[PDB]
C-alpha cells in the first residue's frame with residue numbers, strides 16, 4: 141500500500157503506513173509527484189518508519205503520499221555501466237541517455 | 250506480607266508489595282522458587298521497591314513471589330568465624346560444615362562517634378626499608394597501597410601480612426573484594442599448612458561474582474572486625490581491593506536511575522566511600538589496624554576513585570610503573586608516598602632528617618632528568634655530579650628481596666630493622682660509601698651486605 | 706512527570722467546556738464512568754494492545770459506555786485517544802472533581818476520633834470549619850483506636866490535630882531532643 | 883461502581899487472549915527489538931522469531947521485553 145509523510149526534520153523523514161504494509165529495514169520508498177527516494181533506517185512502531193532522504197528535502201510537506209518499492213536501493217549492473225557516470229541510485233548523471241541495462245541488483249547483501 | 254517481581258534489568262530488580270507492608274531500605278528479601286536474596290536500595294512509590302540481587306538473575310521472571318525478612322543481611326560474628334571461609338551472606342564456602350555462631354549482626358551500621366575516637370601514635374615496624382623510612386606506619390591506623398595493574402600491590406601486602414604477624418598476637422579479618430579466586434585458594438592453603446589459619450577470619454566475593462556480591466562483601470568482613478574491636482581486642486583488617494566496592498557501585502548506578510557524574514562515575518562516589526571508610530577506625534574500646542589495596546585505573550592517580558581515597562588514610566604508599574621497569578622492588582615512589590607519622594615529635598630528629606635528606610636528593614635528581622637525557626651527565630656541575638651519584642645509590646639501596654618473592658627469582662628474603670635502615674641511608678647521605686660501585690646497593694637488605702657485595 | 710502534570714490540560718479543557726455550557730453534572734457522570742470502565746481487567750488489556758489504532762480503541766470505549774456519553778464527551782474520548790492518553794482517564798476525572806469542588810465553594814473534610822462523637826459535636830465542628838474556611842464543609846467522620854482520645858481534622862492539605870496521641874508524641878520529642 | 887448493562891457490554895467486547903509464551907514485535911532498531919506480551923519469559927532466555935532467527939531477553943519491564951538479536955535483524959518487522 142502507500143504511507144504518508146508525518147514528520148520532516150532536515151534529511152530525516154518519518155512516514156506512516158497501514159499496519160499490514162510497513163516497509164522493511166533498508167527498503168527504498170518513493171515520494172509521489174517528486175523525484176525523491178527515502179531509505180528506511182528504523183521501525184519506530186505504530187506503523188511509523190524513520191528514513192533518510194537520498195536528496196534535498198526542500199519543498200516537501202507533511203501528508204504527501206509515499207510508495208514502497210518492495211526491495212532495497214536497486215542499481216543497474218553489467219557491461220552497460222562501463223564508460224558511464226552514475227549517482228548513488230544508479231541514475232546516469234552524464235547527459236548520455238539511459239543505461240542499456242539488462243539486470244538490476246539491490247545494494248545490501 | 251509478600252510481593253511480586255514487576256521488572257528485571259541485569260542485577261537490579263523491582264518488586265511490588267501491598268501499601269501497608271512495603272519493606273525498609275537495606276532490608277533483605279528472598280525469591281520463593283529459587284531462594285535468591287535481594288537487598289532493597291530505594292522505595293519508588295505505589296508500593297514498589299528497587300533492589301540488587303545477591304546472586305545470579307538468569308532464569309528469574311516477572312510475577313514470581315518475594316518474601317520480606319524484616320531485617321538487613323545478617324552475618325555470623327565472634328570466635329566461631331576464625332579459621333573459616335564465608336561468602337557475602339555469611340554462608341560457609343570451605344565445605345567444613347555449619348558455623349557454630351552464638352549471634353549474628355546486620356552488615357549496615359553508623360560509624361563510631363566523634364567522642365569515641367582514639368589518638369594513637371605508636372610506631373609499627375614493617376621490616377621494609379622504604380616503608381619504614383618515608384612511610385612509617387602506626388598501630389590502630391590506616392594504610393593504602395596505591396598502584397596500576399601488575400606493579401606489586403598483592404605481593405607487597407602479603408609481605409606485610411607475613412611481617413606484621415611476628416609481633417601481633419590477636420585476630421585478623423580478611424575481606425576479598427572483587428579479585429582472583431586462585432589467590433584466595435593459594436592464601437587459604439598457605440595458612441592451613443603453616444597452622445596460622447585458626448586466628449584469621451576469611452570472607453570472599455571475587456571477580457567471578459555478580460555486582461551485588463562485590464558491592465556488599467566489604468561490609469561483611471568489616472562487620473566481623475567490628476565485633477572483635479568492640480570486644481576490646483586489637484585486630485588487623487585486610488581488604489584485598491577497596492576500589493572494587495566503588496566499581497561494583499558504578500556498574501549498578503545507571504540501573505538505579507541516577508544521573509552519571511564525571512567520567513561515568515556514580516553521583517554518590519564520595520558518600521559511598523565515606524560510609525564504609527569511617528567504620529574502619531580504632532576507638533576507646535579496641536583497635537583496628539587496616540591495610541587496603543587501592544587500584545589506579547589506567548595508571549591515572551587523578552582519577553575520581555583514587556583521588557577520593559587519599560583523605561581516608563594515615564599512610565599512603567604510591568607504587569610506580571616507571572620504577573618497576575628499572576628492576577627495583579618494592580616499586581614505591583619516595584616523592585609521592587607519605588605518612589602522618591613522619592613528624593619530629595613522633596619518630597625523633599635522626600629518622601626525620603634522614604628521610605628529608607633522601608627526599609631532597611631524589612627531588613634534585615628528578616629535575617636533571619631532561620638535561621641528562623639530551624646532553625648526558627658530563628655537562629653537570631661538580632656539585633650536581635656528586636648528588637646524582639648519591640641519588641643513584643639511594644634509589645638502588647631502597648630495593649629489597651622479599652620472603653614471598655623468592656619463587657619469582659630464587660634469592661632469599663631479608664628483614665631490615667629501623668636502626669639498620671636509618672644507618673644505611675645516613676651513611677650514603679654523609680658520603681661514607683662514595684667509593685663503592687652503584688650495583689653493590691641493588692637487592693641486599695642491610696647496609697653491611699652492600700660492602701660485602703662490592704668485593705665481587 | 707507526575708500523572709497530575711499530564712492530566713491537567715485535559716481536565717481543565719473538560720471543566721471549562723462543562724462550565725460554559727452549564728453541563729457540570731453531566732461531565733461529572735461521564736468522566737466517572739470512563740475512569741471506572743478503563744480500569745476494568747478486560748478493558749485495561751484491550752487499551753494496551755499494539756495492533757489496534759487510536760480510533761479503534763476510542764470507538765470500543767465509546768460503544769461500551771454508550772448512553773452515558775453525549776456528543777461532546779464522545780469527542781473528548783476521541784481526542785484523549787488520538788494523543789495516546791487513555792491511561793490518564795482516572796486522573797482526569799479526579800482533577801475535574803477538584804476544579805468543580807473549588808468552583809462550587811465546597812470542601813470534603815476527613816475526621817478521625819478515638820471513639821464515636823455525637824451529631825451535636827459534628828455540627829459544632831462543621832460550623833467552626835465553615836466559618837474559618839468560608840466554604841461548604843462535608844465531614845467524613847470515622848474512628849481510629851490508635852488515638853488515645855480527642856479528634857483530628859483533615860481539610861485537604863490543612864490538618865488540625867487536637868488528639869492525645871499528638872500530645873504524647875510532642876512530649877517524646879521534647880524529652881528526646 | 884460500573885452498571886450491570888455496561889458489564890454485559892464489556893463481556894461482549896472483541897478482546898484477544900494471548901498465551902503467556904507468545905509475543906508481538908513493537909519496534910526494530912540497530913539489532914535491538916522491543917516485544918509486547920511474553921508474560922513468562924526469563925532473564926537471559928532464548929526468544930524464537932520467524933525465519934529461524936533467535937534473540938536474547940535482556941530488559942524485562944512492566945509493559946514490554948527488550949531483546950538483542952543473535953544474528954541478522956534486518957529481516958525482522960513490527961507485528
Ligand SMILES: Nc1ncnc2c1ncn2[C@@H]1O[C@H](COP(=O)(O)OP(=O)(O)O)[C@@H](O)[C@H]1O
Pocket residue numbers: 396397398399400401402403404405490542544578654657
Ligand atoms: N619482583 C617481581 N617480579 C615480577 N613481578 C612482581 C614482582 N614483585 C611483584 N610483582 C607483581 O606484583 C603483582 C601483585 O598485584 P598487582 O598486579 O600489583 O595488583 P592487582 O592485581 O591487585 O591490581 C603481581 O601481578 C606481580 O606481577
Ligand SMILES: [Mg+2]
Pocket residue numbers: 402403
Ligand atoms: Mg593484585
